[PDB]
């Protein structure tokens, strides 16, 4: 209503925010498949929050009842199995969407100036997401849950001096137990969700401060019409809102297909050994991380030394933070970067996929050799970026976006 | 039909 909105606008900047962030907010008109994943990440975060709130209505964060409570959700709670599968598939889809989001950032140089803070907030979001998923995977209290938590927290025992004390303090016990379960449940259900929501708010605010990149890397703000609107810019609402609605429907089709027909996804979204209750005295023949942690695992497994392996695994994630300063290309988009940048992006993607694929299996000779090679390539993609971004010859970026 | 399908394995012989 006109009068109601006039009353609100005098007392709340509703119309002002709407015209500053969604309408009258002109994003590049050449977004492609790779720009669906921010909105899909928001959708998956909302799905995780809702389904987690509902699982918490029935979950028991105790070592004696966690697994039994999960089965109670799966069988006794009306549609509880739907909510649980939504949550597990939503964690896996959160990591799928976020990895594709980060790979878009890599492809189109979206981390470069002025979006360095956007990239840093996104990486903080990624760290929070990894912590959240790790602590959630302990909640079912299956064999995989318990033993993956055991190994991951023993990693903190690799710190030379304070490692063992730090690991014990994190566990809250001399081993992984119900104390660790309840603690990780509290962190996973409130603390990290709050941190993630705040980080997402900061991320979107920084983006809207500096504006979106585009597949061509063209700074659309340079060319503006008489009204001040970029020539290659269109209002986010309604054009990209409807585009993101279509993307959300497609994502929901895939998401519901997985939920209702293949919730386990061949044992990758719901690992088979995790359907057995945690046993402190019998460890699985082969213990592997959830798929979305597998690459870094491979890196850690590729290093013969324990402390060096932990340091390398941490650096594999920390280097993405400095990525904005590693890239010295005069152009943003891979479309106009030299052959070296394209080759190294291909190498990095292949190495990441191979690291994930070989970290999901028991160690093998070819697997170990390829994991070490891919660790070298993964770190070289970043370490050599400041050099091969300068050595290459880049194409001239068009004044107007293509399409 | 179901009852025959579900008959317990153990059969006990009782006096009378």
């Amino acid at each position: 209503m006109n009068k109601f909105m006039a009353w609100v606008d005098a007392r709340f900047p509703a119309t002002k925010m709407w015209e500053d962030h969604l309408s009258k907010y002109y994003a590049p008109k050449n977004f492609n498949f790779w720009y669906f994943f921010g909105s899909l990440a928001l959708l998956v975060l909302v799905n995780q929050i809702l389904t987690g709130i509902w699982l918490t209505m029935s979950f028991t964060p105790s070592a004696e009842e966690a697994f039994a409570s999960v089965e109670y959700i799966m069988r006794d709670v009306d549609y509880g199995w739907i909510i649980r599968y939504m949550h597990s598939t939503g964690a896996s889809a959160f990591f799928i969407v976020v990895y594709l989001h980060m790979f878009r950032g890599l492809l189109y140089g979206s981390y470069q100036k002025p979006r360095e803070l956007v990239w840093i907030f996104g990486m903080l979001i990624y760290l929070a997401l990894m912590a959240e998923a790790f602590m959630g995977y302990l909640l079912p209290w299956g064999q995989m849950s318990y033993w993956g938590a055991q190994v991951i927290i023993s990693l903190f025992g690799a710190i030379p001096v304070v490692g063992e004390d730090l690991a014990q303090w994190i566990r809250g016990d001399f081993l992984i137990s119900g104390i660790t379960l309840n603690r990780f449940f509290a962190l996973h259900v409130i603390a990290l969700p709050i941190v993630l929501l705040g980080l997402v708010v900061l991320h979107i605010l920084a983006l809207h401060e500096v504006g979106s990149n585009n597949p061509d890397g063209v700074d659309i703000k340079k060319k503006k019409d008489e009204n001040g609107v970029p020539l290659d810019g269109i209002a986010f609402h309604p054009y990209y809102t409807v585009k993101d609605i279509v993307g959300v429907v497609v994502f929901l089709f895939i998401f519901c297909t997985v939920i209702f027909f293949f919730p386990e996804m061949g044992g990758y979204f719901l690992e088979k050994p995790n359907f057995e209750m945690a046993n402190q005295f019998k460890t699985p023949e082969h213990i592997a991380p959830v798929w979305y942690f597998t690459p870094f695992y491979a890196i850690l497994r590729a290093v013969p030394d324990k402390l060096m392996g932990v340091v390398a695994m941490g650096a594999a994630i920390a280097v993405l933070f400095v990525l904005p300063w590693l890239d010295r290309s005069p152009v943003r988009s891979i479309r106009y970067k030299g052959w070296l940048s394209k080759l190294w992006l291909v190498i990095f993607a292949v190495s990441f996929v191979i690291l994930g694929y070989y970290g999901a299996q028991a160690p093998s000779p070819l697997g170990t050799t390829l994991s070490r090679v891919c660790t070298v390539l993964y770190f070289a993609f970043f370490i050599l970026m400041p050099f091969y971004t300068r050595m290459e010859k880049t194409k001239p970026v068009p004044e107007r976006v293509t399409g | 039909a179901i009852a025959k399908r579900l008959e317990p394995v153990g059969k006990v012989c009782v006096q009378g």
Binding site: A68, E71, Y72, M74, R75, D76, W81, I82, P238, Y239, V242, K243, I245, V246, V249, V250, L252, F253, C256, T257, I259, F260, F261, P263, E264, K272, P273, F275, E276, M277 | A1, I2, A3, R5, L6, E7, P8, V9, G10
Partner: protein, 232 residues
């Protein structure tokens, strides 16, 4: 090497026979404590009174979980390994693994219970289905001849052409109630019931997912039209 089994979760009779087998030969050591008798009866089509009379041996109520008197610690002490809860064993191991495991027990005097398992070597489980299967041994029997996947059947009778192999699971004749096919069907029904127990929402999941996907296709048509239009 596992053996494939085609498990039909819509077969109420097979699931009922599997539930009977589980209640009689299995719940002595194994619990199904994440699963209630009431839900099992509802999904298998067993009347509640019939479920109470025929499958509930522990004095539990219809709505009670399929708990057993054997405690995990006691059974671990007695057998050397705790008999795991079998509600989700179909998901933990898969139906093919269970089908091959329950048919792979063979006499092995070197073992604590006189038996070993091809699928689960040095398993701590006694061969509790020996009365049905009969004495199974690692002996010499006729196996279909295969040469690089060149599998020979009899063109006329349609039965396999066989040669003797001396490292095969052979059931000693006239040692069990059921022949090979009858024990195969018994194990198939048991594994079908276990598959239902692991995933009791499978059929409803498929139905609901079909309807959800139909709705999402409809909504996609509308959203795609609202997008491509309004992008002109």
């Amino acid at each position: 090497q596992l053996d494939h089994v085609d498990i039909d979760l819509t077969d109420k009779a097979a699931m009922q026979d599997g539930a009977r087998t589980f209640a009689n030969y299995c719940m002595g050591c194994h619990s199904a404590k994440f699963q209630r008798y009431e839900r099992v009866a509802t999904d298998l089509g067993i009347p509640a009174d019939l479920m109470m009379e025929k499958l509930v041996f522990t004095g539990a109520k219809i709505g009670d979980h399929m708990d057993i008197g054997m405690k995990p610690a006691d059974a671990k002490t007695w057998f050397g390994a705790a008999p795991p809860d079998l509600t989700l064993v179909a998901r933990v191991r898969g139906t093919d693994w269970l089908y091959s495991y329950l048919r792979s027990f063979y006499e092995d005097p070197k073992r604590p219970w006189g038996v070993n398992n091809v699928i689960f070597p040095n398993v701590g489980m006694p061969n509790v289905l020996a009365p049905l299967q009969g004495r199974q041994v690692i002996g010499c029997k006729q196996v279909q001849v295969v040469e690089d996947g060149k599998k020979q059947f009899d063109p006329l009778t349609g039965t396999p052409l066989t040669h003797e192999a001396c490292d095969q699971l052979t059931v000693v004749p006239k040692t069990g109630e059921l022949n090979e096919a009858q024990f195969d069907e018994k194990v198939k029904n048991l594994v079908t019931f276990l598959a239902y127990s692991a995933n009791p929402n499978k059929l409803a999941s498929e139905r609901i997912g079909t309807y959800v996907l139909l709705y999402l296709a409809f909504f996609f048509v509308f959203a795609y039209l609202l997008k491509r239009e309004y992008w002109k």
